[PDB]
């Protein structure tokens, strides 16, 4: 049974036992034990072929000495290091043999003194198998085990004259003080003997697939029994650097069970150091919780926190005796920042809210945009949406009032048409011209059917900032022939365009009569522009179907733009829930639901729950003076959000003939009835616990100076109780 051992004085020394012993020294990074570790062999020796037992010295001088006990019973003490000045050169290679032939299973060393040699061999004919020699610095130290087989033994660490004697089917408490004094207890587990170093009186055993541990003071029955294993155990050992930790290795087992015995249930942990079952592993006595396992392919495998969150988007971490903090190099942080700019508090200029959002987001920029037109439209059916409003040329004659009144209002809401019946896009035209989005203006004029005006616009744009001129040269080809080479070619070739407005315009110019199917199903263009084109071009049934399908798609997706067509309604509520699911931003949604919702809409359970969630979040952020701002807006917009009366002065004896408008207050520090003619300094405080009160300034000064209930013969701190 090969096993891996380490030097008792050096931690960088690693050994693998076989028919040819290999000694290696660990160096930082030859065998690569780990990714950053390399082990270089010190020497190779095979002085003990077909060996059965081995041990190690109990003294630094000499070092690099390990037992070589072959099956013949001979005990050979060989040292592998560069021996030049050994403390006991006489013992180097000392040939010790037993009188009767036998095979030694396990060899252990006495810790307190190294001048003795104790080992157990096979059962003798009729004689004592357990004969221990004296190492010192031709006769043995002590012998026992008459006609008995000792599977294993070891000298106890607490007492130099203490060791364990195990019979064939029993364990005998052998005392070196008096060999005639021994106590034997019958047991089946006489193998895998392991003992905790911290718990010197605790012993353990490994017996095939069953492991039993018994206490020395109660060595009559096993204290507990380990789980039965199918594979036989390969090695049982106790980790010395970890309290209440034991390691059990099974033959042909790739996962090593590690039970936690520090409870007195035992917490068993399975460790797999490699994909191949390691024959044995060695725990580090100097390093903390370090174990090196030896794979059967001459591979040395070596194997060896608290986390939390924070309300300001921080993570706290811990490890052993160390702690760590994590911070961003976030939805919550973005919401907090949006709060930090006083976003959503605008009343005079709702247009400014999108800018107040700060970040570049078209959806939010669309979101506040839609209300801004809606805000002007108010100055209630407008909040219903495009759906409710919509519920109620074979050629292109390029060169307005014919639009329906509902269509006119829809276009006005979309931002294209200003107030009044003046159907003139010159306002939006000049606004776009100053805005710089020349392509959008060109598309709009094309929708407004001003071809040469669009030509002038594109030429002026080219006068600003090349490609635009050639695009316009293509634009000059507005031909409506059904057998068209120009339309046969450019209609396909337009796909190479980068800006999608030009491609949309080319498609519209080159599309068939009426069938503007690609017009609606364009997804990379602005929503309001598409809606306006559909309203100003499509047929009534066609427009209704297009609006319905677009609304369904927007509700299914959850895009902030869709609020404009959906409006503030139950469908608006569903869209808000969809957006919350998509992102989860509350503050934006919270104000959005507060954008003039009706009483029925404000009665939505989803809306109230979302507002309450935002309120709780705003409370947790500690932004003291800001939560009241949301409360104020809630009370202003809605009269159901009114606060309760809360405090109500009516108690004690009432009384009459003495009233303000006997007495209820008295100034404990001035004894003046309250209410007499820094305004906050003239109020009167009251004590929830101290059942007292007095002038606010007087109480403030006294509590600043004095630190007790100024209420006479009282002890309850009327203010130093919350400890803010």
Is 53 annotated to bind a ligand? Reply is: no
Nearer to other proteins by Cβ, of 4 and 339: the residue is 339
Q: Between residues 437 and 577, which has the closer beta carbon with respect to other proteins?
A: 577
701 binds other proteins (CB under 8 A): no
**Shortest separation between residue 327's beta carbon and other proteins, angstroms:** 6
Q: Is 687 annotated as a binding residue?
A: yes
By CB under 5 A, is residue 692 in contact with Zn ion? yes
Do 415 and 373 touch, CB atoms closer than 8 A?
A: yes
Stretch that binds other proteins, among 105-113, 166-174, 311-319, 466-474 (CB under 8 A): 311-319
Residue 323 binds: one of Zn ion, other proteins, none (C-beta under 5 to 8 A by kind): other proteins
Residues 616-635, interacting with other proteins (CB under 8 A)? 616-617, 620, 622
CB-nearer residue toward other proteins: 408 or 607: 607
Task: Using the structure block, give the residue that is written with the tokens 């007499």.
Answer: 676
315 binds other proteins (CB under 8 A): yes
Segment contacting other proteins by CB under 8 A, of 29-37, 503-511, 608-616, 641-649: 608-616
Residue 433's H or E segment, with its range, is: helix 426-435
- Contact residue for Zn ion among 299, 718, 723, 724 (CB under 5 A): 718
| Least distance between other proteins and beta carbon 620 (Å) | 6
Q: Is 322 labeled as ligand-binding?
A: no
Q: Among 529, 39, 661, which residue's Cα sits nearest to residue 302?
A: 39
Q: How far apart are CA 680 and CA 667, in angstroms?
A: 16
> Is it true that the peptide bond before 62 is cis, omega within 30 degrees of 0?
yes
Say whether residue 311 binds other proteins (CB under 8 A). Answer: yes
Contact 687, 710 (CB under 8 A): no
Give the range of 32-40, 213-221, 388-396, 580-588 binding other proteins by CB under 8 A. 580-588
Residues 54, 70: Cα–Cα separation, whole Å? 9
Residue 625, annotated as binding a ligand: no
Helix H or strand E segment including 31:
strand 31-34
CB 259 within 8 A of CB 243: no
- Encode 158-185: b = buried (16+ Cβ within 10 Å), e = exposed: eeeebbbbbbeeebbbbbbeeeeeeeee
190 interface partner picked from other proteins, Zn ion, none, CB below 5 to 8 A per type: none
Residue 609 is a binding residue for other proteins (CB under 8 A) = yes
Closest CA to 500 of 532, 543, 529: 529
Asked whether the CA dihedral 90, 91, 94, 98 is positive or negative, the reply is positive
User: Vertex 67, ends 66 and 71: CA angle to 5°?
Assistant: 150
Give the interface segment with other proteins, choosing from 30-38, 61-69, 117-125, 578-586 (CB under 8 A): 578-586
Mask for 210-249, x = binds other proteins (CB under 8 A): ----------------------------------------
91 token code pair: 């013992």
Handedness of CA 413, 418, 420, 421 (dihedral sign): negative
Instruction: Tell me how far apart the alpha carbons of residues 106 and 3 are, in angstroms, rounded to a whole number.
Output: 11
- Least separation in angstroms between residue 91's CB and other proteins is 44
Render 242-271 in DSSP notation, one character per residue.
Answer: STTEEEEEETT-SSEEEEE-TT---EEEEE
3-state secondary structure 51-68: CCECCECCCCCCCCEEEE
Q: Is residue 656 involved in binding Zn ion (CB under 5 A)?
A: yes
* 524: contact with other proteins by CB under 8 A: no
Q: Give Cβ neighbours of residue 354 (< 8 Å, ≥ 6 apart).
A: 364, 365, 367, 368, 369
As a whole number of angstroms, the distance between CA 240 and CA 243 comes to: 7
698 labeled binding residue? yes
Q: Which of 308, 470, 493, 672 binds other proteins (CB under 8 A)?
A: 308
503 carries a ligand binding annotation: no
Q: Does 474 bind Zn ion (CB under 5 A)?
A: no
How many residues bind to Zn ion according to rule CB under 5 A? 17
* 692 assigned ligand-binding residue: yes
User: Which position among 125, 139, 322, 625 is part of the footprint of other proteins (CB under 8 A)?
Assistant: 322
**Residue ranges that bind Zn ion, judged by CB under 5 A:** 654, 656, 659, 667, 669-670, 687, 689-690, 692, 694-695, 698, 709, 711, 714, 718
**Residue ranges that bind other proteins, judged by CB under 8 A:** 262-263, 265, 305-311, 313, 315-318, 320-332, 335, 577, 580-582, 584, 586, 605, 609-610, 612-613, 616-617, 620, 622, 723
């Amino acid at each position: 049974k090969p096993d891996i051992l380490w030097a008792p004085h050096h931690v960088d020394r690693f050994v693998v036992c076989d028919s040819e012993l290999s000694l290696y020294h660990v160096e930082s990074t030859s065998l690569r034990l780990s990714e950053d570790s390399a082990a270089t062999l010190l020497s190779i020796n095979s002085d003990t072929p077909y060996m059965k037992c081995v041990a190690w010295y109990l003294n630094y001088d000499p070092e690099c000495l390990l037992a070589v006990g072959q099956a013949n019973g001979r005990v050979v003490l060989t040292s592998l290091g560069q021996d030049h000045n050994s403390k006991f050169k006489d013992l180097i290679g000392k040939e010790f043999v037993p009188k009767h032939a036998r095979q030694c299973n396990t060899l252990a060393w006495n810790p307190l003194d190294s001048n003795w040699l104790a080992a157990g061999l096979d059962k003798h004919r009729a004689d004592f198998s357990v004969l221990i020699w004296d190492i010192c610095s031709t006769k043995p130290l002590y012998e026992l085990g008459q006609n008995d087989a000792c599977l294993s033994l070891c000298w106890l660490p607490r007492d130099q004259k203490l060791l364990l004697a195990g019979m064939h089917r029993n364990l005998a408490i052998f005392d070196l003080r008096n060999t005639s004094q021994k106590m034997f207890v019958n047991t089946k587990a006489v193998q895998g003997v392991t003992v905790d170093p911290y718990f010197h009186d605790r012993v353990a055993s490994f017996y095939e697939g069953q492991v039993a541990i018994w206490d020395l003071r109660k060595f009559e029955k096993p204290v507990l029994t380990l789980t039965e294993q199918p594979k036989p155990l390969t090695k049982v050992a106790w980790c010395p650097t970890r309290t209440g930790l034991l390691a059990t290795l099974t033959r042909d087992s790739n996962i090593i069970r590690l039970y936690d015995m520090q409870h007195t249930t035992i917490i068993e942990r399975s460790v797999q150091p490699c994909d191949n079952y390691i024959a044995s592993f060695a725990w580090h006595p100097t390093s903390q919780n370090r174990m090196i396992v030896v794979t059967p392919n001459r591979t040395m495998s070596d194997f060896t926190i608290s986390l939390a969150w924070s309300p300001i988007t921080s993570l706290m971490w811990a490890c052993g005796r160390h702690l760590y903090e994590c911070t961003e190099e976030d939805i919550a942080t973005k919401m907090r920042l949006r709060a930090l700019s006083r976003y959503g508090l605008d009343t005079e200029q709702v247009w400014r809210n999108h800018i107040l959002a700060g970040n570049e987001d078209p959806q939010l920029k669309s979101l506040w945009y839609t209300l801004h037109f809606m805000k002007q439209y108010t100055e209630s059916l407008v909040y219903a949406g495009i759906k409710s409003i919509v519920k109620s040329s074979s050629r292109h004659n390029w060169s307005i009032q014919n639009l329906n009144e509902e269509r006119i209002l829809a276009l006005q809401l979309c931002g294209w048409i200003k107030k009044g019946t003046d159907v003139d896009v010159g306002p939006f035209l000049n606004s776009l011209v100053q805005e710089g989005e020349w392509e959008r203006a060109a598309a709009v004029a094309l929708f407004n059917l001003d071809i040469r005006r669009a030509i002038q616009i594109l030429n002026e744009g080219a006068s600003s900032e090349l490609n635009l001129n050639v695009v316009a040269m293509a634009l000059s080809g507005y031909t409506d022939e059904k057998n068209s080479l120009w339309r046969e070619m450019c209609s396909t070739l337009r796909l190479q365009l980068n800006n999608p407005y030009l491609c949309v315009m080319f498609a519209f110019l080159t599309s068939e009569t009426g069938s503007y199917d690609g017009v609606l199903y364009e997804n990379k263009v602005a929503v309001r522009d598409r809606v306006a084109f559909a309203c100003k071009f499509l047929s009534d049934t066609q427009l209704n179907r297009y609006i319905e399908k677009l609304t369904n798609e927007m509700k299914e997706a959850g895009n902030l733009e869709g609020i404009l067509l959906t409006g503030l309604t139950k469908d608006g509520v569903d869209l808000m829930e969809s957006y919350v699911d998509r992102t989860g931003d509350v503050q934006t949604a919270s104000y959005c639901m507060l954008q003039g919702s009706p009483l029925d809409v404000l009665k939505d359970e989803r809306v109230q729950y979302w507002i309450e969630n935002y309120r709780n979040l705003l409370d947790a952020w500690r932004f003291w003076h800001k939560r009241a701002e949301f409360d104020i807006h809630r009370s202003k917009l809605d009269p159901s959000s009114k606060p309760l009366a809360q405090v109500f002065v009516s108690c004690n004896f009432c009384g009459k003939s003495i009233s303000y408008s006997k007495p209820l207050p008295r100034c404990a520090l001035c004894l003046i009835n309250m209410g007499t003619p820094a305004q906050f300094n003239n109020w009167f405080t009251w004590c929830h616990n101290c059942r007292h009160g007095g002038h606010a300034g007087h109480m403030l000064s006294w509590f600043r100076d004095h630190a007790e209930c100024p209420v006479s013969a009282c002890t309850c701190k009327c203010m130093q109780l919350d400890t803010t």
